Amino acid sequence: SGFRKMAFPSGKVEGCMVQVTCGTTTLNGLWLDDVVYCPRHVICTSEDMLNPNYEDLLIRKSNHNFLVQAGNVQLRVIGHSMQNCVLKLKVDTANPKTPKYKFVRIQPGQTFSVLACYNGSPSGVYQCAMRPNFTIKGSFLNGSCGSVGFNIDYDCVSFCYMHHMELPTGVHAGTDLEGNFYGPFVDRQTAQAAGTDTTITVNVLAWLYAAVINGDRWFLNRFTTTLNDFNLVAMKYNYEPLTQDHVDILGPLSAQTGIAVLDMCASLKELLQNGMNGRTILGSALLEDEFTPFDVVRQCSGVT
Amino acid sequence: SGFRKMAFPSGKVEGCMVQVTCGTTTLNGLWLDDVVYCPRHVICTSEDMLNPNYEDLLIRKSNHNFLVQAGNVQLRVIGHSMQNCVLKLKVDTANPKTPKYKFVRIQPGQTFSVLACYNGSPSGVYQCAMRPNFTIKGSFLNGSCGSVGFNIDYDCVSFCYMHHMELPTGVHAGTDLEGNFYGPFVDRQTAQAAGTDTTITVNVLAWLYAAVINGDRWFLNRFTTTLNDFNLVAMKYNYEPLTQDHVDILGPLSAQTGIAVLDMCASLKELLQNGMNGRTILGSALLEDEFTPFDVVRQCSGVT
Ligand SMILES: *CC(=O)N1CCN(CCNC(=O)c2cccc3ccccc23)CC1
Ligand SMILES: *CC(=O)N1CCN(CCNC(=O)c2cccc3ccccc23)CC1
């Protein structure tokens, strides 16, 4: 037993990280097969931050201007193209460590692991969630752009995120591996403010089930609620509305614990209204929302 | 910017995980060079849980009774020996993926990453701290024994922990890689209760410095304190006493932020006495103590 914020093992993704330099800018690239994916802003100077015209800036770049280094070995760039906000650098060598992979575009509320990198070198791994306002709360310094987010299904890595920027509020924005930003963000240093960072209700409920499974039960009460009643309280507390789809997704956890989903909603409703009163749930003094129901089942069952 | 509970990249350790089966018991082993390290309780049945005599149980075990599998390939066991609470299974093949490594015995308050494994297969990675009562708060189900804790210094993995057991309170106990338990715990299913789980004061202070660096500054106050005054409050709140050594260790963070260590102690003192008042620091509603000052510097500087 015990329940931790756990990331996927990062080895399969470490084997894909390369350094990409264009002029004075160095960031990370993701090397899969014979293609290196990286943020297109690698071609920008600090001068081009306000209003970059990427097609125009790219005309001045040739294959030999993109320096790609895998470990201490240089890769030969034989083609380059821009797809949305990412560049795809075709190299003459397929990555010998390319895992089975997919490019997926996740929905808000979904979690993933990030392998934070600097100069093509992995520094750490942590678990994130795509927030309902399409930002992520990561840990990214200068040089971390091009670090990726992913999930693993046994031996297949599903890449879902590539880091591009930090908003002036300290939250992060990026793209899927087709180069499309999550949310309304753009790769421009301009006034971009995030919307409401609502709490992912279905994830909090999943985490309350994890708490019960792992012995933390104090918050269980004698009440029940309905989706409509619960949602009036959820709206008041800036929680995402709970749908019948979320109830169905929590079905296996409800079966395992014998606690009906709406009864867990009533426990959550009292926690929202009454607070924790200085108590903790799974070592947390707030309601954790960065575990999906799948993460809870995975961690509670021991999926490898 | 942004500050996350980050684990080290786990690839170097994934390359070392093997499955070890003895009779009906399957757990994990750590394969370094031509030796596989695993908990000696792999030789126990559920029957032997109350009072195992490991020397006696081991007499009935031969090299061919220890089934070691690396991926889908069996390893040949050519010797076995018991060192404290671990078994060392000599195999005929050196692990080709053996990283540069050290075996270190950590002190309470020190953090490390755990690669949770089942049947020799990695399931996830998370960051832990050796608690002042010599337990860890992990995430370990049946089959996770033999999973290891480690730190990485550039390319050298320092293994500090191997998982052996769960106390009836849900907290975890294990050994260093020489097989010596941290704290007073034994590999016996008996009444073993943990002592006071005090808060690692120097780590909370380090995390308050990380908060200031990353923009969360509301808790900064107009006060200062002394080590003695601070420690009267720390004792009252079950915090570890702060020493001049801890003050010296926080020196670089104090220099970076311009906030004297004793001034940060006075901020911590008011947080202890007044609580958070429903506010958060780095997304936490409690004072986080599982980041050492070295972790904060590492994460804030971008060490790879
Ligand atoms: C996150 C990261 O590693 N970055 C790479 C280095 N840049 C500095 C130079 N680039 C910019 O200032 C710049 C220019 C155009 C557009 C953007 C968009 C997002 C971030 C930076 C941008 C900082 C980011
Ligand atoms: C953590 C883990 O994966 N374990 C391996 C499987 N055992 C079940 C069988 N072993 C015991 O019940 C047993 C016997 C003797 C001594 C101990 C000491 C600690 C834990 C189990 C023990 C459970 C643990």
From Swiss-Prot, chains A, B:
There is a cross-link at K5, K90 (Glycyl lysine isopeptide (Lys-Gly) (interchain with G-Cter in ubiquitin)). Inhibited by pyridone-containing alpha-ketoamides compounds 13a and 13b. In turn, alpha-ketoamide 13b (tert-butyl (1-((S)-1-(((S)-4-(benzylamino)-3,4-dioxo-1-((S)-2-oxopyrrolidin-3-yl)butan-2-yl)amino)-3-cyclopropyl-1-oxopropan-2-yl)-2-oxo-1,2-dihydropyridin-3-yl)carbamate) inhibits SARS-CoV-2 replication in human lung cells. Inhibited ex vivo by michael acceptor inhibitor N3. Inhibited ex vivo by compound 11a and 11b. It is found in: Host cytoplasm; Host Golgi apparatus; Host nucleus. Residues 1-304 are cytoplasmic. The active site is at H41, C145. It catalyses: TSAVLQ-|-SGFRK-NH2 and SGVTFQ-|-GKFKK the two peptides corresponding to the two self-cleavage sites of the SARS 3C-like proteinase are the two most reactive peptide substrates. The enzyme exhibits a strong preference for substrates containing Gln at P1 position and Leu at P2 position. Residues 1-304 form the Peptidase C30 domain. 3CL-PRO exists as monomer and homodimer. Only the homodimer shows catalytic activity. Interacts with host FBXO22; this interaction promotes the proteasomal degradation of nsp5. Cleaves the C-terminus of replicase polyprotein at 11 sites. Recognizes substrates containing the core sequence [ILMVF]-Q-|-[SGACN]. Cleaves and inactivates human TRMT1, preventing tRNA guanine(26)-dimethylation of tRNAs. May cleave human NLRP1 in lung epithelial cells, thereby activating the NLRP1 inflammasome pathway. May cleave human GSDMD, triggering alternative GSDME-mediated epithelial cell death upon activation of the NLRP1 inflammasome, which may enhance the release interleukins 1B, 6, 16 and 18. Also able to bind an ADP-ribose-1''-phosphate (ADRP). This is 3C-like proteinase nsp5. It comes from Severe acute respiratory syndrome coronavirus 2. The gene is rep.
